[model samples]
Target chain A: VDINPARALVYQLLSSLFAREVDEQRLKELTSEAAQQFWEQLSLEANFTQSVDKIRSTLNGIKDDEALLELAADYCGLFLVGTSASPYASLYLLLFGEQHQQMSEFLHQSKLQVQSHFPEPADHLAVMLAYMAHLCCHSENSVQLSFLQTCVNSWLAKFINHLTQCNKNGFYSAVATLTLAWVKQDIAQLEPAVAIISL
Target chain B: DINPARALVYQLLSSLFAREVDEQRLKELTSEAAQQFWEQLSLEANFTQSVDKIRSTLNGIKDDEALLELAADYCGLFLVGSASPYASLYLGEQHQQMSEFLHQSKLQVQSHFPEPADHLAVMLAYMAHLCCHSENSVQLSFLQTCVNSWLAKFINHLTQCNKNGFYSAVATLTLAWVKQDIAQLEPAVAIISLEHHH
Candidate 1:
């Protein structure tokens, strides 16, 4: 959990944005303050223990981060998807096309994009992504939909949406806010010179 | 400071994932935790030294529903305020009143949570996971509240007692209940929507 703080943020971002409307500034603040919280809450979204144990074994057996990074790469690769209901609403679930074209579209998009720097173990990258995304939303006080579309459009159909559909309880409640996490990460790159303004 | 309920949960859940550890040591620790739990509550019913007694009467069988019932009761046992897990936080009139978050803050002093979030918060998340999986929606909500407070309080008490075995026993019972729920609802999914689960 050295970097677990960051890992948790990724899930938090997706969790809150699953069924939500984006508000960049507020969300960014939440991410900055709450990314660590989300990282800790990682167990809240997935079988963290299972993942950690697997990563530990992988790292120990291979004495490398390659296996772990591969795992993280796959996870970070998914930022959003489409749903079963409305196409717009279901974008997180990749239900856009009537057929498997939605899945195909996702695969194609992955090939075109370059990976972003999310420093952490493969298992913990989601947490970092979540934190980064959350921070941007806070600085702006409202998320830019354009940024969200750019960052998460292709990967949105990943596990974030899957967690929502599972609906075990309110466990994944934060998923509706995932767009906030992705948006936060995307926007943080806006103007490196943008000075911090007090809310 | 650290996981009080963890040792016990680790022992049982470990068995779930792998094999048993020091059986004799494990039994002793659980026994102590159970005894300490009853002594601390002083009000909890069905107190007993024999593990089987508590198991059969207090927790019922290993089925998912039975497990959730035990966890629901454990959650309620702490916050005498509402006494049920499912409705306490997520459903009905009691949730907002006896919510999990509020109850957990009560015994945070020596809980020894390693991460940033309150240990109680983590436990409540687990309880919420249990509730969502319940067959009875009403019961699930009740269990949610009870686990957040009552069960959380129980774990706190166990940790403070410092008897790994007793803590293990109670933790085992509570987790057993949660496991049932997870099998049904998947604790991972339910815990995230914790508020919804309760």
Candidate 2:
């Protein structure tokens, strides 16, 4: 009935993707027949379609366990255990400066907490995306739009670009493209409704 | 046996000690569901008093100022390196073995936060993971070696250094809960050992 739940689900999926390495269960889910239909339904533009296609084909090519291992390694290389393409918003935005406190205060005001299970800084992209999902499920559109524009959109494009540069044509590169495209699309949908409410 | 309840308890403890109390977490801890769970847990003869203390302490927290007080207490106890929560600090070089254990199980400390693998929160989360997977012997060994070895000493230090009563009660409850879990696991482990010998 309401669109916010679908929006929250997308944010949750993106959050899970960036949160950790993909396990066998997640891999199985992504490659399932239903996942194919889900991807097809979200095929909104060239960027969305192409990223989904890459994700589909790459996952489909994982015919054995080793492919999953390779994907895991790719995740580690792209996000964790390295200096290249660090996923913290502070890194891309402020180089670990005031943004941490800014984001922390924002989350506090929003009455959200980064779950202890995550154990990342407040500015981590996964945590930020997860926060957005919470906002979608619970807050007004104005709050959601403010969070995206102020906190998320500030560095997401740069992070995606850096990710693409570091990992060209890899699974995460596709992921980056999809994230950028989907977030842009969400913002586009939100801006007008929020503006109208202001009138 | 796979025990979601046991896993959840371990998970809750891990979350509590992992970071300072946030409003959301305080709300969860004070919610009706959590209150029911605590009441049920306190029904155990050994846990009744300690759980009552924990319940009372959590119930006393009403606002952000109270949360800030607990946060300060958390900082003094755990973050100041006085009452350290790392197993290696108390167990001495055993953290390497703990790291190996996690590796073999395909788990690791979250690289983003980057605490030692032997941090109590990590170990407890691993225990939770093991509970869900039904790895009895591995859980027993980990509990006995990695957790049980250093937990009492850590709790002793925590009790001595804690200025606020909240975490002190939590430490006591943790010790009681772990001891009970170990008691439950020992019989199953012994049965497995006898089967292996046969």
Candidate 3:
């Protein structure tokens, strides 16, 4: 299947949101000239302007040291130590109640090993997004759709809702909105491909 | 029972054998960690003959061309014309590379770890890992499976071709260190096959 740079960018950006705690280095880079240009380019065609504006304003106003402490607490409170809004796929959207092993098996079958750069559970939202990005680059549309429909699309909206409500730092809240909008847009775009396969 | 000194030595040697030896990395090795391990090694065996030879060579090795010669020696000895520092070479009767065998088995070199499964450095690193777990039976079996199978040949190859006495000392110390550990470990465990499960 053909790879789309736009889709890959969305997947990558969304994945980065869940990958690791945002450090000063990453925050600085996000506000850097290169990253600003990249987001500006994405904004030219996409409807992410609202989410983009929120993110830029939040980032611009944030004080690194003060924001660092609160963000760390926000991350732990929302995803790590907190229960209701856990970032794990199984726990974050507990209705489906699928085990993480299933996701891990999907990764193995896909010939992709989860990177141990920063260790996390196999079914962590960031890792799954990264996996989705990888599949977008290399796999067929049927497989990509299978992962998206079964694993991603189901839990994403509610996950974003919980994130935006509970997030003290607007950084993750803006990211949540951006991620939801981006994925919904991409999935809508992919309806024709899925339709062809179903027929 | 947790032998930090030997573990550090193995870690150092594993790193040295893994990549191409360079001035910056070598400086880190010989100075920062290796120096401390060298002192500890002296307390154990007065490693003067083996390690002192290494120390002198290190002291004299300031020239870029000399460093390049060591790099060439390393490449020639391990990577290029000579026997590779991979454990698969010494282990089994299969003529193909042991990395292929490892990949075919569940014990892939590239699966969980950064290094190849049969790479000597990988094996050494695995040993260091196993050391932390303190599974003597697992350690002994692994030693037999990975190191014992080919270490003698590797040392012979090194001493013969290693005109620069630096790696020759390295080989000597490596042999002495591992052999000593093997002696202490003794043979009390079940003779399991060397194929690493998981």
- Which pairs clash inside model 2? none
Task: Give me candidate 1's TM-score against the actual structure.
Answer: 0.16
The TM-score of chain B in candidate 2 is: 0.48
Models sorted by DockQ, best on top: 1, 2, 3
Model 2 DockQ reads 0.01
**Tens-digit lDDT track of model 3 for A1-199:** 5222333344334334434456788778878998889767745633444445555555666676896666545444433433323222222112111322232232333333222222222233443454455455556667656666766666766655654454443333343344445456556656677689766
TM-score (C-alpha) between model 3 and the true structure:
0.26
Instruction: Tell me the chain A TM-score of model 3.
Output: 0.44
Poorest stretch of ten by lDDT in candidate 3 chain A: A88-97
Model 2 residue B116 distance off true place after TM-score fit, in angstroms = 16
The per-residue C-alpha lDDT of model 1 at residue B94 equals: 21
**Across the candidates, what are chain A's individual TM-scores?**
0.21, 0.48, 0.44
Residue range with the least summed lDDT across 10 consecutive positions in model 1 chain A: A82-91
lDDT of 1 by residue, A71-108 (tens): 33332332121111111112111211232222223223
1 or 3, which is superior by DockQ? 1
